[PDB]
Write a protein that binds this ligand. Sequence first.
Ligand SMILES: NC(=O)c1ccc[n+]([C@@H]2O[C@H](COP(=O)([O-])OP(=O)(O)OC[C@H]3O[C@@H](n4cnc5c(N)ncnc54)[C@H](O)[C@@H]3O)[C@@H](O)[C@H]2O)c1
Ligand SMILES: NC(=O)c1ccc[n+]([C@@H]2O[C@H](COP(=O)([O-])OP(=O)(O)OC[C@H]3O[C@@H](n4cnc5c(N)ncnc54)[C@H](O)[C@@H]3O)[C@@H](O)[C@H]2O)c1
Ligand SMILES: NC(=O)c1ccc[n+]([C@@H]2O[C@H](COP(=O)([O-])OP(=O)(O)OC[C@H]3O[C@@H](n4cnc5c(N)ncnc54)[C@H](O)[C@@H]3O)[C@@H](O)[C@H]2O)c1
Ligand SMILES: NC(=O)c1ccc[n+]([C@@H]2O[C@H](COP(=O)([O-])OP(=O)(O)OC[C@H]3O[C@@H](n4cnc5c(N)ncnc54)[C@H](O)[C@@H]3O)[C@@H](O)[C@H]2O)c1
Ligand SMILES: [Ca+2]
Ligand SMILES: [Ca+2]
Ligand SMILES: [Ca+2]
Ligand SMILES: [Ca+2]
Ligand SMILES: [Ca+2]
Ligand SMILES: [Ca+2]
Ligand SMILES: [Ca+2]
Ligand SMILES: [Ca+2]
Ligand SMILES: [Cl-]
Ligand SMILES: [Cl-]
Ligand SMILES: [Cl-]
Ligand SMILES: [Cl-]
Lengths: 315, 315, 315, 315
Amino acid sequence: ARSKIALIGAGQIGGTLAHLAGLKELGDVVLFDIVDGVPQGKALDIAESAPVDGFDAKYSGASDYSAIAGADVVIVTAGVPRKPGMSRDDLIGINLKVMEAVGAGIKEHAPDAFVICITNPLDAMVWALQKFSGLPTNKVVGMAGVLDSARFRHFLAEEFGVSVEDVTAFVLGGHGDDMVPLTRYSTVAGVPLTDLVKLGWTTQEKLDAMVERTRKGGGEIVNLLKTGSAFYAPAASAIAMAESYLRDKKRVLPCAAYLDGQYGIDGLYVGVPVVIGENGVERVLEVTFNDDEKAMFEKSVNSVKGLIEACKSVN
Amino acid sequence: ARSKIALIGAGQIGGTLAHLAGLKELGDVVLFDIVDGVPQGKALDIAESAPVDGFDAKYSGASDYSAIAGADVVIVTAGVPRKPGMSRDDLIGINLKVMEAVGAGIKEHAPDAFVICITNPLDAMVWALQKFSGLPTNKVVGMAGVLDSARFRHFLAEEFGVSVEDVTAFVLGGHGDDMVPLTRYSTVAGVPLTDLVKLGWTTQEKLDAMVERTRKGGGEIVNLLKTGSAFYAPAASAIAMAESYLRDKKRVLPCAAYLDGQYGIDGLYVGVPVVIGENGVERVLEVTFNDDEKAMFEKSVNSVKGLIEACKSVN
Amino acid sequence: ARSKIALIGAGQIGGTLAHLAGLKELGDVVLFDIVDGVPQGKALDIAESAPVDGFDAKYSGASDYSAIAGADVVIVTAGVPRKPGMSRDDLIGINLKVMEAVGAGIKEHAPDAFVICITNPLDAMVWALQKFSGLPTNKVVGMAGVLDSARFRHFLAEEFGVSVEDVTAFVLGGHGDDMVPLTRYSTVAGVPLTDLVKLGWTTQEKLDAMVERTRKGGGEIVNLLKTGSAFYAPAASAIAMAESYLRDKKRVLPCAAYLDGQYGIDGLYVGVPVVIGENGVERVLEVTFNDDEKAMFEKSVNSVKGLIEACKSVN
Amino acid sequence: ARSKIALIGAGQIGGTLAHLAGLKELGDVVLFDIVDGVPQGKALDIAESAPVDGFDAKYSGASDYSAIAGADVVIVTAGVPRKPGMSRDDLIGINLKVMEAVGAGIKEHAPDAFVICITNPLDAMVWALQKFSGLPTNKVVGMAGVLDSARFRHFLAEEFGVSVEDVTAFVLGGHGDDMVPLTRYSTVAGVPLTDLVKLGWTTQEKLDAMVERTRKGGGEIVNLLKTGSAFYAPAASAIAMAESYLRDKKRVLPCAAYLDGQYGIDGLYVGVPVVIGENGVERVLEVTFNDDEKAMFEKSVNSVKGLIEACKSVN
Ligand SMILES: NC(=O)c1ccc[n+]([C@@H]2O[C@H](COP(=O)([O-])OP(=O)(O)OC[C@H]3O[C@@H](n4cnc5c(N)ncnc54)[C@H](O)[C@@H]3O)[C@@H](O)[C@H]2O)c1
Ligand SMILES: NC(=O)c1ccc[n+]([C@@H]2O[C@H](COP(=O)([O-])OP(=O)(O)OC[C@H]3O[C@@H](n4cnc5c(N)ncnc54)[C@H](O)[C@@H]3O)[C@@H](O)[C@H]2O)c1
Ligand SMILES: NC(=O)c1ccc[n+]([C@@H]2O[C@H](COP(=O)([O-])OP(=O)(O)OC[C@H]3O[C@@H](n4cnc5c(N)ncnc54)[C@H](O)[C@@H]3O)[C@@H](O)[C@H]2O)c1
Ligand SMILES: NC(=O)c1ccc[n+]([C@@H]2O[C@H](COP(=O)([O-])OP(=O)(O)OC[C@H]3O[C@@H](n4cnc5c(N)ncnc54)[C@H](O)[C@@H]3O)[C@@H](O)[C@H]2O)c1
Ligand SMILES: [Ca+2]
Ligand SMILES: [Ca+2]
Ligand SMILES: [Ca+2]
Ligand SMILES: [Ca+2]
Ligand SMILES: [Ca+2]
Ligand SMILES: [Ca+2]
Ligand SMILES: [Ca+2]
Ligand SMILES: [Ca+2]
Ligand SMILES: [Cl-]
Ligand SMILES: [Cl-]
Ligand SMILES: [Cl-]
Ligand SMILES: [Cl-]
């Protein structure tokens, strides 16, 4: 009866998720992959690390979905990268097929799980995974906003020369051009960034550049690493979501969540602040937008709609 | 060369400070008191607890100030309680005498320390302790606002049904009638409390009652315990300040800090948000007040002035 | 569905248990006492500390046993101290009456709990509490040996100048003259203390003195504090036991456990190494004694028998 | 003045070291590599993860050694893998050249560092790195034994069904055929494994198989992963060593250490238990061997001698 965490995909993010789940003593971990040996090896390596910090957790790797039976949390990173010669449709086609298999596995073996999707393109993959698995919409979420929040917080803390603990970033929507930052609901110690510009703690230009840097943040890591994308911050972000579920913390975190009318939207996964507790997505915090924000949010949702239409077109 | 933390006063708060410093692996601890046996016993008890969690720290107790030599941080709780038959002047008279002795001990033995005063009445005792010790004003601070922030955060998190991690409370000034809350710079996930009332997440009345409950918070604990005042939250609050110094975190925390013109004030210790790092109080965040806040802050400073005048009157 | 920890007794150890349970994020906490106000005040103080470290836990205080309903773990410190004018029989008489009330409360309200008794005299109180509550014998244990282990580990680590993390102490039986140390199964980095004497890392005399100091350890703290007994190490020790249950860690810890024939003993609570997991006391590790150890253990069990007979005599 | 940790090599182990150093709040981190972009990207990714857990640490990546200036700890993983078409001499030739460059960089820029070598073949690379850097022999160590200890502890804990926290493994020498296990100084709760066989908690055959599995442990991970070797347990192991230095914990850990006559050996790096504190390798624990162990240790040292001779032959 420790909690059981199944990690579907045992690649860069999945290994990191597994390591964090151990260090944080969140429970037992099953790593799943289609590449045999990989999840077993990473599982055993992490298991062998455990006596150094003293965490007691069972680790195992598998390529059969029976291994995930009764998982409390399932975190999905399974899929393929968009190689330079691949279309968007190609990628969606491929990773939709992966979501199909993953959804079937969760449906059969872990129907009571809280599912956190990470696989790109996230706002479509999470939507697809919920549909394929049939799980309740409040029990399937996507990680995206926490990562954007984390990047922006790092840039802010560096700018102001203050602890990351005292910075808050408010972001909705998706990544990149689909991100909807509210600098007025972003703060240092409760003071909004817009007021910090008035105080002269920063400048409008520096603030705008930090917002843009957050939009571009994923690509900035790709451009440095060259062989892959970011994994430490993505994994940390999803573990925060998982921990909030497992420990019923009721964190308020921006995640891709199924909207039943909130923000004027019905039937789509959109990045919004949600309370995560033992019942999954328990409430959506719907803020009041100004005009600039309404228009940014509308673009962002249209982007999601266009990708969902591409999914239906390819499946 | 581990950091050295000296705790001047080994009573309710001082024991708790000592326990937290161990658990958090902040360094070696010296407990100091005039009651012989007390600091030695608590030190040894905590030392004996250490193998259970695995923290390596030296613990000792003393009643001679040579024991605090070279302390990196000194946290002062030494003093007496205001027994029902004691005046304010009586208390100040008594605890000023204690600050005199403590200041002399720090001056001689730990002149390079970051000093955190807790002893009441705080805004006067911290002012007195800086004067008696001669330490640089940026290296002597008082704990008060963090405690108020913590209480208000607890009440907010309970009200909204969210994690304490996603609530921010902005408080300046002192405790009780001297507290200067800014609900507009208090937030859930970046959203100000004033906006949460507009969203219907709470009500104005409930918000006002939580502010009042924070004002009264110390007395609320006294009224429950009957034999003494709060100690767990006070100790946690001061340890946050200490940790920010020791780990150069540059937390932004409301503390009683010496103002050199900020907030229009020169030569007084006033509760304000400060960045705490390896150089002590490194910057004061001076916010822009609305009218209600200016007047509340002016009352609060006048209160401090009146207590400083009472000190001079009694010493 | 967070775990629920009920702390029966909200005095020195009980407050400390409550604080540790928060810091370690073990779950929700209910403090129970007959002195109204005390558990409510300590609960609220700890709750108010929580936003400083970011632990999400509900805290409450009560003087009605309905408050403990559904507790996963119950830790019992309720009782009175042996004031200088009180007999052993007096104390047992009094604290047996307390165990009667506590056992009735657990029986009615938390029948599925893992119960950890701390109240003295421990080997009798734990036996009595199991009988009064009717809970399964594997779900009721007493804390004693972990504390002795912790003290001895502290003394060893100081002697050898090594980390507390690399010292192991093996103790069975009770405290004081009833303690049964096995220095040959006590180690630094796996090397037994008896071999460390041969290596010249210490001396036989120093080793014997550390054993004696452990026997006397509780009194050593009393003699320093004067107003009460140890509480930081006692609380840490019991929390280790609780955590092993709650997280199914299967720690091997010396505890007062009900023996069903192990060590040649049937029907008594005796200090022995036990594996603690989600099923309670899951296995007893029965070591093979040398002659000196057999005789020490036999004395220790006879001591327990004599105290159980005194209980029956007074109840 | 936070501690500064330089990680020379930003590959599989180096990234993991960097992540752990953040999570454990050990200090600022510089990742160094010859592949430009890699250390910068991993540094930035980890930095961006920090606001999720709240660790304050500066992260940077570099390919110039000036970046490591004033490092308190330097952990070396730089080097190349032994590709299937490469000799032992080839590998040594190559990685000796890497140690030459790394040693020069440490000499010039971080002469006061505690250096932890990980690069294979470890017992030669650590010896070479000390010679190239000129640092004091007590300030240069190799990680190997902690990893073996950790693997064996995992296997033991699984065998006995107990917490990893209560298992101790005693290993000297190197990996594989060069490992020198002492099962008699390996324990569960202080009870030696040899006694646990007598108690019937395991069997001689199972114990022997766990020893052999530890010998083969690195290869077991390679055989599962196929693309590389273990990294989570290796990184955890070295971080334990680093933390012991940085926090002056005086852990007793099996590491490749320069022997000045201990174990009968002068002038070689050999795996032995050492106390690690703020002065580096502060003491070597020299145990007394039985005959089987003496012969195993002699083989193991001869193996080291043969590799040192191969180094001199290739350099
Ligand atoms: N949501 C976000 O904010 C965010 C941020 C970063 C990365 N990502 C996305 O996360 C995903 C994972 O990234 P990564 O770096 O771990 O990738 P990776 O390529 O290292 O890992 C993916 C793993 O999935 C496995 N896999 C492939 N097909 C599978 C199947 N049918 N079933 C099970 N497993 C399968 C692969 O074998 C591989 O081990 C990618 O799609 C990436 O774009 C998302
Ligand atoms: N700043 C705040 O927000 C805040 C909040 C709570 C409590 N307080 C104050 O903190 C202080 C400590 O509270 P507590 O509950 O620990 O009190 P306590 O009475 O338990 O402890 C005070 C200790 O100081 C010792 N002492 C007395 N005179 C001394 C001297 N001359 N030198 C050294 N030690 C001496 C006493 O022996 C005692 O052990 C009190 O003044 C209290 O009002 C402040
Ligand atoms: N087992 C060990 O190794 C060990 C070590 C140290 C202390 N102890 C024992 O632990 C016990 C607690 O010590 P402490 O320092 O916390 O004591 P304490 O006196 O501070 O606390 C005891 C609490 O129990 C309460 N209480 C009294 N009667 C009660 C009842 N009928 N129902 C509920 N609550 C009641 C009291 O009001 C008090 O708050 C003592 O018996 C002590 O001897 C055991
Ligand atoms: N001691 C042990 O117990 C143990 C256990 C496991 C692995 N290892 C060894 O640890 C080492 C690192 O393993 P890994 O998985 O991280 O390897 P890796 O190949 O992922 O990383 C090595 C890094 O070193 C870099 N590098 C190469 N030449 C360099 C130079 N001249 N200067 C600076 N950087 C350079 C590479 O670019 C690469 O990023 C390997 O030699 C491996 O065999 C040791
Ligand atoms: Ca632990
Ligand atoms: Ca609406
Ligand atoms: Ca530790
Ligand atoms: Ca101004
Ligand atoms: Ca947390
Ligand atoms: Ca038997
Ligand atoms: Ca923190
Ligand atoms: Ca010798
Ligand atoms: Cl270890
Ligand atoms: Cl323990
Ligand atoms: Cl805080
Ligand atoms: Cl977060």
